[PDB]
Scaffold this active site. Structure first.
Site, PDB file in Angstrom:
ATOM      1  N   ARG A  46      43.788  25.208  30.841  1.00 31.52           N
ATOM      2  CA  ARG A  46      45.116  24.704  30.464  1.00 31.52           C
ATOM      3  C   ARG A  46      45.767  23.965  31.601  1.00 31.52           C
ATOM      4  O   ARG A  46      46.339  22.898  31.395  1.00 31.52           O
ATOM      5  CB  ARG A  46      46.043  25.817  29.982  1.00 31.52           C
ATOM      6  CG  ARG A  46      45.612  26.470  28.692  1.00 31.52           C
ATOM      7  CD  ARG A  46      46.648  27.476  28.236  1.00 31.52           C
ATOM      8  NE  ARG A  46      46.466  27.898  26.833  1.00 31.52           N
ATOM      9  CZ  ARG A  46      46.477  29.159  26.406  1.00 31.52           C
ATOM     10  NH1 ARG A  46      46.641  30.179  27.254  1.00 31.52           N
ATOM     11  NH2 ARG A  46      46.313  29.413  25.122  1.00 31.52           N
ATOM     12  N   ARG A  92      51.962  46.248  27.212  1.00 33.53           N
ATOM     13  CA  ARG A  92      50.692  46.294  27.917  1.00 33.53           C
ATOM     14  C   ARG A  92      50.062  47.693  27.865  1.00 33.53           C
ATOM     15  O   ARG A  92      48.893  47.825  27.517  1.00 33.53           O
ATOM     16  CB  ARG A  92      50.913  45.870  29.367  1.00 33.53           C
ATOM     17  CG  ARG A  92      49.665  45.405  30.073  1.00 33.53           C
ATOM     18  CD  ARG A  92      49.975  45.054  31.513  1.00 33.53           C
ATOM     19  NE  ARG A  92      48.979  44.141  32.055  1.00 33.53           N
ATOM     20  CZ  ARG A  92      48.906  43.765  33.329  1.00 33.53           C
ATOM     21  NH1 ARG A  92      49.779  44.226  34.224  1.00 33.53           N
ATOM     22  NH2 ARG A  92      47.946  42.923  33.707  1.00 33.53           N
ATOM     23  N   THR A 112      45.813  32.583  19.349  1.00 29.38           N
ATOM     24  CA  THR A 112      45.062  31.499  19.979  1.00 29.38           C
ATOM     25  C   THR A 112      43.580  31.725  19.697  1.00 29.38           C
ATOM     26  O   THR A 112      43.103  32.861  19.717  1.00 29.38           O
ATOM     27  CB  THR A 112      45.274  31.388  21.508  1.00 29.38           C
ATOM     28  OG1 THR A 112      44.511  32.392  22.181  1.00 29.38           O
ATOM     29  CG2 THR A 112      46.720  31.518  21.883  1.00 29.38           C
ATOM     30  N   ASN A 137      42.124  41.802  25.860  1.00 29.13           N
ATOM     31  CA  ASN A 137      43.224  41.981  26.805  1.00 29.13           C
ATOM     32  C   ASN A 137      43.732  43.410  26.864  1.00 29.13           C
ATOM     33  O   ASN A 137      43.581  44.142  25.883  1.00 29.13           O
ATOM     34  CB  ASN A 137      44.405  41.095  26.434  1.00 29.13           C
ATOM     35  CG  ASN A 137      44.364  39.761  27.127  1.00 29.13           C
ATOM     36  OD1 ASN A 137      44.069  39.677  28.323  1.00 29.13           O
ATOM     37  ND2 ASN A 137      44.667  38.706  26.388  1.00 29.13           N
ATOM     38  N   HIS A 146      44.864  37.466  35.251  1.00 29.19           N
ATOM     39  CA  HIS A 146      45.006  36.636  34.075  1.00 29.19           C
ATOM     40  C   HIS A 146      46.391  36.751  33.450  1.00 29.19           C
ATOM     41  O   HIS A 146      46.938  37.850  33.346  1.00 29.19           O
ATOM     42  CB  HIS A 146      43.974  37.016  33.022  1.00 29.19           C
ATOM     43  CG  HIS A 146      44.218  36.381  31.692  1.00 29.19           C
ATOM     44  ND1 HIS A 146      44.209  35.016  31.514  1.00 29.19           N
ATOM     45  CD2 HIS A 146      44.484  36.917  30.480  1.00 29.19           C
ATOM     46  CE1 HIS A 146      44.460  34.737  30.249  1.00 29.19           C
ATOM     47  NE2 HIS A 146      44.630  35.873  29.599  1.00 29.19           N
ATOM     48  N   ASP A 161      43.318  30.013  31.693  1.00 28.25           N
ATOM     49  CA  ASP A 161      44.482  29.613  32.493  1.00 28.25           C
ATOM     50  C   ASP A 161      44.192  28.328  33.261  1.00 28.25           C
ATOM     51  O   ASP A 161      45.025  27.407  33.312  1.00 28.25           O
ATOM     52  CB  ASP A 161      44.911  30.696  33.514  1.00 28.25           C
ATOM     53  CG  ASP A 161      44.868  32.108  32.958  1.00 28.25           C
ATOM     54  OD1 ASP A 161      43.816  32.516  32.411  1.00 28.25           O
ATOM     55  OD2 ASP A 161      45.872  32.835  33.104  1.00 28.25           O
TER      56      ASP A 161
HETATM   57  N1  LIG Z   1      41.254  36.409  28.287  1.00 32.78           N
HETATM   58  C1  LIG Z   1      41.849  35.351  27.529  1.00 32.78           C
HETATM   59  O1  LIG Z   1      42.178  34.291  28.075  1.00 32.78           O
HETATM   60  C2  LIG Z   1      42.079  35.534  26.064  1.00 32.78           C
HETATM   61  C3  LIG Z   1      42.873  34.541  25.292  1.00 32.78           C
HETATM   62  C4  LIG Z   1      43.077  34.933  23.857  1.00 32.78           C
HETATM   63  C5  LIG Z   1      42.888  36.340  23.394  1.00 32.78           C
HETATM   64  N2  LIG Z   1      42.352  37.314  24.302  1.00 32.78           N
HETATM   65  C6  LIG Z   1      42.180  38.525  23.496  1.00 32.78           C
HETATM   66  O2  LIG Z   1      41.192  38.540  22.510  1.00 32.78           O
HETATM   67  C7  LIG Z   1      41.466  39.782  21.773  1.00 32.78           C
HETATM   68  C8  LIG Z   1      41.320  39.512  20.380  1.00 32.78           C
HETATM   69  O3  LIG Z   1      42.097  38.485  19.880  1.00 32.78           O
HETATM   70  P1  LIG Z   1      42.149  38.190  18.347  1.00 32.78           P
HETATM   71  O4  LIG Z   1      43.220  37.146  18.079  1.00 32.78           O
HETATM   72  O5  LIG Z   1      40.759  37.752  17.854  1.00 32.78           O
HETATM   73  O6  LIG Z   1      42.451  39.601  17.673  1.00 32.78           O
HETATM   74  P2  LIG Z   1      42.188  39.881  16.118  1.00 32.78           P
HETATM   75  O7  LIG Z   1      43.110  41.010  15.720  1.00 32.78           O
HETATM   76  O8  LIG Z   1      42.455  38.622  15.320  1.00 32.78           O
HETATM   77  O9  LIG Z   1      40.739  40.422  15.886  1.00 32.78           O
HETATM   78  C9  LIG Z   1      40.241  41.537  16.536  1.00 32.78           C
HETATM   79  C10 LIG Z   1      39.026  42.121  15.999  1.00 32.78           C
HETATM   80  O10 LIG Z   1      38.650  43.274  16.722  1.00 32.78           O
HETATM   81  C11 LIG Z   1      38.083  44.096  15.756  1.00 32.78           C
HETATM   82  N3  LIG Z   1      37.871  45.459  16.186  1.00 32.78           N
HETATM   83  C12 LIG Z   1      38.810  46.415  16.267  1.00 32.78           C
HETATM   84  N4  LIG Z   1      38.249  47.576  16.685  1.00 32.78           N
HETATM   85  C13 LIG Z   1      36.944  47.377  16.871  1.00 32.78           C
HETATM   86  C14 LIG Z   1      35.878  48.175  17.292  1.00 32.78           C
HETATM   87  N5  LIG Z   1      36.098  49.562  17.629  1.00 32.78           N
HETATM   88  N6  LIG Z   1      34.628  47.672  17.374  1.00 32.78           N
HETATM   89  C15 LIG Z   1      34.432  46.377  17.048  1.00 32.78           C
HETATM   90  N7  LIG Z   1      35.431  45.576  16.647  1.00 32.78           N
HETATM   91  C16 LIG Z   1      36.692  46.030  16.541  1.00 32.78           C
HETATM   92  C17 LIG Z   1      39.041  43.937  14.615  1.00 32.78           C
HETATM   93  O11 LIG Z   1      38.487  44.406  13.446  1.00 32.78           O
HETATM   94  C18 LIG Z   1      39.245  42.549  14.583  1.00 32.78           C
HETATM   95  O12 LIG Z   1      38.331  41.933  13.714  1.00 32.78           O
HETATM   96  C19 LIG Z   1      42.859  40.180  22.131  1.00 32.78           C
HETATM   97  O13 LIG Z   1      42.810  41.216  23.046  1.00 32.78           O
HETATM   98  C20 LIG Z   1      43.406  38.984  22.771  1.00 32.78           C
HETATM   99  O14 LIG Z   1      44.381  39.234  23.648  1.00 32.78           O
HETATM  100  C21 LIG Z   1      42.127  36.950  25.635  1.00 32.78           C
HETATM  101  O1  LIG Z   2      46.765  32.379  24.925  1.00 34.05           O
HETATM  102  C1  LIG Z   2      46.936  33.579  24.999  1.00 34.05           C
HETATM  103  N1  LIG Z   2      47.497  34.271  23.972  1.00 34.05           N
HETATM  104  C2  LIG Z   2      47.761  35.704  24.101  1.00 34.05           C
HETATM  105  C3  LIG Z   2      49.059  35.717  24.871  1.00 34.05           C
HETATM  106  C4  LIG Z   2      49.904  34.614  24.844  1.00 34.05           C
HETATM  107  C5  LIG Z   2      51.009  34.739  25.574  1.00 34.05           C
HETATM  108  S1  LIG Z   2      51.003  36.312  26.364  1.00 34.05           S
HETATM  109  C6  LIG Z   2      49.474  36.740  25.625  1.00 34.05           C
HETATM  110  C7  LIG Z   2      47.966  36.389  22.773  1.00 34.05           C
HETATM  111  C8  LIG Z   2      49.117  37.139  22.533  1.00 34.05           C
HETATM  112  C9  LIG Z   2      49.322  37.777  21.318  1.00 34.05           C
HETATM  113  C10 LIG Z   2      48.360  37.664  20.327  1.00 34.05           C
HETATM  114  C11 LIG Z   2      47.205  36.917  20.568  1.00 34.05           C
HETATM  115  O2  LIG Z   2      46.264  36.798  19.604  1.00 34.05           O
HETATM  116  C12 LIG Z   2      47.002  36.281  21.789  1.00 34.05           C
HETATM  117  C13 LIG Z   2      46.657  36.396  24.903  1.00 34.05           C
HETATM  118  C14 LIG Z   2      46.359  35.625  26.162  1.00 34.05           C
HETATM  119  O3  LIG Z   2      45.950  36.296  27.252  1.00 34.05           O
HETATM  120  C15 LIG Z   2      46.508  34.279  26.205  1.00 34.05           C
HETATM  121  S2  LIG Z   2      46.148  33.350  27.665  1.00 34.05           S
HETATM  122  C16 LIG Z   2      47.616  33.339  28.650  1.00 34.05           C
HETATM  123  C17 LIG Z   2      48.648  34.238  28.346  1.00 34.05           C
HETATM  124  C18 LIG Z   2      49.816  34.254  29.100  1.00 34.05           C
HETATM  125  C19 LIG Z   2      49.969  33.382  30.171  1.00 34.05           C
HETATM  126  C20 LIG Z   2      48.939  32.497  30.492  1.00 34.05           C
HETATM  127  C21 LIG Z   2      47.766  32.469  29.748  1.00 34.05           C
HETATM  128 CL1  LIG Z   2      46.517  31.345  30.205  1.00 34.05          CL
END
Ligand SMILES: NC(=O)[C@@H]1C=CCN([C@@H]2O[C@H](COP(=O)(O)OP(=O)(O)OC[C@H]3O[C@@H](n4cnc5c(N)ncnc54)[C@H](O)[C@@H]3O)[C@@H](O)[C@H]2O)C1
Ligand SMILES: O=C1N[C@@](c2ccsc2)(c2cccc(O)c2)CC(O)=C1Sc1ccccc1Cl
Ligand SMILES: NC(=O)C1=CN([C@@H]2O[C@H](COP(=O)(O)OP(=O)(O)OC[C@H]3O[C@@H](n4cnc5c(N)ncnc54)[C@H](O)[C@@H]3O)[C@@H](O)[C@H]2O)C=CC1
Ligand SMILES: NC(=O)[C@@H]1C=CCN([C@@H]2O[C@H](COP(=O)(O)OP(=O)(O)OC[C@H]3O[C@@H](n4cnc5c(N)ncnc54)[C@H](O)[C@@H]3O)[C@@H](O)[C@H]2O)C1
Ligand SMILES: NC(=O)[C@@H]1C=CCN([C@@H]2O[C@H](COP(=O)(O)OP(=O)(O)OC[C@H]3O[C@@H](n4cnc5c(N)ncnc54)[C@H](O)[C@@H]3O)[C@@H](O)[C@H]2O)C1
Ligand SMILES: O=C1N[C@@](c2ccsc2)(c2cccc(O)c2)CC(O)=C1Sc1ccccc1Cl
Ligand SMILES: O=C1N[C@@](c2ccsc2)(c2cccc(O)c2)CC(O)=C1Sc1ccccc1Cl
Ligand SMILES: O=C1N[C@@](c2ccsc2)(c2cccc(O)c2)CC(O)=C1Sc1ccccc1Cl
Lengths: 324, 330, 324, 327
Positions: free
Chosen positions: B167, B104, B246, B136, B191, B164
């Site tokens: 789901r 984290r 995801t 995140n 979250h 969350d």
């Molecule tokens: N809140 C929730 O429930 C979410 C559930 C799923 C994922 N959540 C988050 O979305 C983000 C992104 O997930 P993702 O799977 O899309 O990550 P990727 O690595 O595949 O893509 C990230 C993009 O971020 C870009 N990136 C990286 N740096 C930058 C900057 N500085 N400006 C703009 N864009 C940037 C990078 O080039 C990538 O294209 C990550 O923090 C996850 O934990 C949160």
């Molecule tokens: O669904 C996900 N996938 C991520 C994850 C999953 C388990 S812990 C973090 C995740 C992790 C790593 C890479 C990535 O692209 C996303 C990011 C994220 O926040 C979620 S939602 C989530 C995660 C943990 C418990 C409950 C929920 Cl509802």
């Protein structure tokens, strides 16, 4: 006395077959784009996914399932076994791996098609995997379905890209820019300049040098850009997904809702343009609840017919050498 | 003349400023799923995409544009420069690259650093936008978006517990054989791992499950309905193990929030907001409660009666989050 | 060869039956509002309309037909003869007079219901005509259908209006305002105060005077204003149409797409709340492809339960004197 | 404290000016059909209704509001006072009441003299979409009374005519009307012009396949398809007494291009001076590009000599009525 039984009184357990089921075979980038577009257009009451990579399959299924709150498709299933695909109206084959490519993929269909047929004997097949015109023939052959139930994605995406590029030139929404790319999908496709129009105003009539070497504005560039854009997308992001998925969802809409809209898809053209071989090419077809019920007989110039005839020869040359 | 001029008479070439523009920052799996879901819901008249990876960015844009025939969003733009994001009503931040095995704190510091350049650029070109934070750890990064932007509280929204809760309702619908829409239940607080399922609110047709089944949510539950919340946590790790990330579920949930915002619906969603002044929380932390969402972002919040144990889990999250946040430098 | 045969080559001509057909009986204000809403929600591939006034019927059909370009329902038919309703998944009855009200609508149903069943034996019946709880029983009785396939519109509109009024007071969208009005449609419905909530927060727990005379805020008038509103709309406008159309379309969506959402609709409640007679009243029901598969067993207070039993006695008192 | 305040904590007491607002003037059969179709297509975040019959207006507003649970348009308002219409993006005029013609005209001009200035005062930046008949003339009247640039004054024009034509075409060919292209231009109604040269499926010109298309010697008499368009309109009126659904749907289609800046091409009435040898301020339907600024562009359809002459005749007749109107 479970909480369920305390909360809910059941009138019947009479479970029934899904009435508007769609299956996608192959959960790669193409198949999943098809799936999400299909889910968001409310076309199916049950969606099934099939692939050989079990982990990736289950994970995609669950990810879709977790969006169920925001959808109107109450049952999503998956499995390597084809019993999950039972009673599909429409089965969409995207399975592949991005003349070597043909027999490689022909062996795959020899497993897939009979299994699809086994569980949904009366479904429509929509082939997306490349080479799509050859592979639509392969599926038609192996399944033994009547020609109307075996549809190739063909030039649907080509035409869509064309209409986008045309709309950019004219400053007009692609919906209102009409133009057809027919024949063999991909590199050897045929832009039918005579059909290009906005509001019924044929661009050929206004501009008789349209799409020729003479043309002062080089509208042939637009068709060239259709193919160039396809290579550039792969160069930039590694694969194509969103546009093909949206276009397949549009075909599925006409089929599932028996719309009888006209689309450029791959169908057996034997009997047209002097072609006598059992081969599939793109013409405008009427799509509905038993697939391709009708096709539109487009008038082609001698040069355009020749291009389709050359594609049909090239494709039969590959197909006669195939082992089923 | 040219063909365009022979075909079309122009009345005027004036103005042309977007009325319902949405920007997505970060075109990874999450970003693009947000983009496609937003496009298929006809929420925007212009979509802007931003990333640092220029090749990928351009190809993703093109790929969406080639589907234009099948959409009603007439303009899609993209760029590394934030001038393409000007006049956005809503800006969605999904940037930062996902967590591997990394922690984290490592996620926190790398993404805080990323936001320090993203947020001021967003604010410059869209001073009046609502900000929706998905990256995140979402609750911390929503705070960070708020601190840097200088935006009032109503215009900084974290995706928070919206997924969350989705789901949870999915899982609840499975056990009951009812559509998730008709299964009501709220997962609140921080979250992810530490989220809080509010048992007292779980109901179908206004019938409290807890009232019917007093052991619901406890260890003494013979049906273990407490596993439903556990499975929300478990299913997330499982999806990541199976497919590597995801995308679809988060993209769909985010498009739902975008719908409420763009159309000024004033629907209630569980999203992260600045919660100072509730549950004996006194620090500047963002946690998920039920929030009324509309054209001004979060205009109002619902005051949920929590149990002693639910109140304690929120306060604990608030203490932990603030512990991290005080040691950040801006 | 005709122009059609010149333009279009037929693969197969055999007419397929509709997959998702809905019939609306009675093309008055309510019937046509149901139709337009159903059409703009893409629920049907065929819409059939029936009425006894042949001119109004034909004209209403044509008027819908002329909007086909903007719709996704490829066939719209009408007729006084029920053969046009063949193969309907769902048949919605809105025919009737806008005790005397009962007997004359019962005489209408003696002709309508057998004809419906003749041409669509496996259909779900959705009854809207008033008095809806009585007429739902009448339809059940005459059709011989199992109870799961006979659905009364019931308290669905009452609850929709309740949620609108609740939303206005709280400044929250009715979708996020939850509350159930149950029992007998119209004047004698019961607002279930214990279920009234936003985000799972009970209004009754927060405001114990809720739904009583002691209430300084008169929340009890929200339910009264549901009844006052109906009379007011009629006084001002002469009839109601849009609200009921929209509510019926939402029920149709769950049925046709098998959603298994819960709606307050009228169903056989014999066996519940001490009720012994063959009467239909509104409780929350799960709706899908088989109509009402399940029912939610709402916990009612002693007074609420007695209000329901009272309605059942009253409804049976009428029902036992009817001639079929 | 009140129940609301115990339940809900407020961050800000609102409220922004309306952002995607539509008004419909005249809640008759046509206006209410426009209203329902706009609501079911999620085109507005605020719908305003206006009419002069108080009771009817209030009753229609309430009826719509009672379906709010099933809609995504959170604010529905009405009134005889045009303050309720403030800050509309698009104002749709369906006011008048069903039908001589010059009777209908000078009668509806008297109405527009009150309506249009009121519309302008509360939404000086709106697009006007005129539906009321005679539509081509009444679009001219709204244009002149408002003082709006021509791009913001749109007549429904031949949109309904072209949609009926496409329905009929699709019925003949066994194809969905969406895939049957064909344009009915000029004066809305009796005097409209079917442009046979543009009629196609999949870019196959039916005129090229069948050079007799739309001519007297046509063995299949495709001319009847245009005549049926006009006959359809009289038949509907005879059978049900009015037209509503089809016009409502078509109007909603226009609203969608406008509110979403789609730049689709529609057959609508626009100021046609400087084309087809027309020299007067007359509004006739040609294919127009519709977006957030109304009509930004028009398509220059190549018309036969006979097609052009029919447009010219409509222009002369229309102008002869217009020149005599008292504003
Ligand atoms: N809140 C929730 O429930 C979410 C559930 C799923 C994922 N959540 C988050 O979305 C983000 C992104 O997930 P993702 O799977 O899309 O990550 P990727 O690595 O595949 O893509 C990230 C993009 O971020 C870009 N990136 C990286 N740096 C930058 C900057 N500085 N400006 C703009 N864009 C940037 C990078 O080039 C990538 O294209 C990550 O923090 C996850 O934990 C949160
Ligand atoms: O669904 C996900 N996938 C991520 C994850 C999953 C388990 S812990 C973090 C995740 C992790 C790593 C890479 C990535 O692209 C996303 C990011 C994220 O926040 C979620 S939602 C989530 C995660 C943990 C418990 C409950 C929920 Cl509802
Ligand atoms: N006709 C058109 O317009 C378009 C055609 N296509 C085609 O789509 C196909 C796939 O594209 P991508 O998704 O990008 O490839 P991909 O590699 O990302 O995915 C392919 C999937 O097929 C699966 N698969 C392989 N063998 C299988 C089998 N025997 N049974 C079930 N599943 C199997 C793989 O597991 C994999 O998940 C390619 O053939 C590509 O050319 C691609 C886009 C445009
Ligand atoms: N259940 C609810 O929530 C409802 C809300 C509004 C209306 N509800 C009832 O719908 C029906 C119909 O109301 P509507 O306003 O549409 O009445 P109309 O008079 O405009 O239309 C009735 C039509 O019914 C036709 N009719 C009349 N008899 C027949 C027969 N025998 N077959 C077919 N059609 C028939 C008649 O010719 C009319 O066209 C009536 O009993 C209302 O109390 C109840
Ligand atoms: N362009 C097309 O293709 C159209 C096809 C169908 C009808 N079109 C016309 O719509 C209008 C309205 O037709 P509608 O059928 O709805 O007439 P109604 O009589 O039912 O409704 C008219 C309403 O107009 C109201 N009205 C009347 N005067 C006013 C004023 N001054 N302000 C506001 N509202 C007014 C009046 O009270 C009524 O409620 C009429 O001129 C039709 O020829 C045009
Ligand atoms: O858009 C694509 N991408 C593919 C491609 C692109 C250039 S040549 C083949 C492709 C290739 C490799 C992987 C992959 O995922 C897709 C597969 C394919 O058929 C298409 S559509 C296309 C391809 C070539 C010319 C014109 C068109 Cl409209
Ligand atoms: O809203 C309506 N209007 C009707 C009515 C109104 C007052 S008493 C009966 C009605 C009456 C006449 C014509 C018509 O189309 C409807 C028919 C009807 O059932 C309803 S719903 C209603 C009616 C009374 C109380 C509460 C409700 Cl939720
Ligand atoms: O469809 C309609 N009905 C009206 C009509 C019909 C025949 S002449 C005028 C009409 C007339 C009277 C009352 C009313 O509500 C509508 C008003 C109108 O303009 C139309 S569209 C129309 C009319 C004539 C020819 C072709 C068309 Cl596409």
């Amino acid at each position: 006395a479970t909480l369920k039984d305390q909360l809910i009184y059941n009138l019947l357990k009479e479970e029934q077959t899904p009435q508007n089921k769609i299956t996608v075979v192959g959960v790669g980038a193409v198949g999943m784009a098809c799936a999400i577009s299909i889910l968001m257009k409310d076309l199916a009451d049950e969606l099934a996914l099939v692939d050989v990579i079990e982990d990736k399959l289950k994970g995609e299924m669950m990810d879709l399932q977790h969006g169920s709150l925001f959808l109107r498709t109450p049952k999503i299933v998956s499995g390597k076994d084809y019993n999950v695909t039972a009673n599909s109206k429409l089965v969409i084959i995207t399975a592949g791996a991005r003349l070597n490519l043909v027999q490689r993929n022909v062996n795959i269909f020899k497993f897939i098609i009979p299994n699809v047929v086994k569980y949904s004997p009366n479904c429509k097949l929509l082939i997306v995997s490349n080479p799509v015109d050859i592979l639509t023939y392969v599926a038609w052959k192996i399944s033994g379905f009547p020609k109307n139930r075996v549809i190739g994605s063909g030039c649907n995406l080509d035409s869509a890209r064309f209409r986008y590029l045309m709309g950019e030139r004219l400053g007009v929404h692609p919906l209102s820019c009409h133009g057809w790319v027919l024949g063999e999908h991909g590199d050897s496709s045929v832009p039918v300049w005579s059909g290009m129009n906005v509001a019924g105003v044929s661009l050929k009539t206004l501009h008789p040098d349209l799409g020729t070497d003479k043309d002062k504005e080089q509208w042939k560039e637009v068709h060239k850009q259709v193919v160039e854009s396809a290579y550039e997308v792969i160069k930039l992001k590694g694969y194509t997904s969103w546009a093909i998925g949206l276009s397949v969802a549009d075909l599925a809409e006409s089929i599932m809702k028996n719309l009888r809209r006209v689309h450029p898809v791959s169908t057996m053209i034997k009997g047209l343009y002097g072609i006598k071989d059992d081969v599939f090419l793109s013409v405008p077809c009427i799509l509905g609840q038993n697939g391709i019920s009708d096709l539109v007989k487009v008038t082609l110039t001698s040069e355009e017919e020749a291009r389709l005839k050359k594609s049909a020869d090239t494709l039969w040359g590959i197909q006669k050498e195939l082992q089923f």
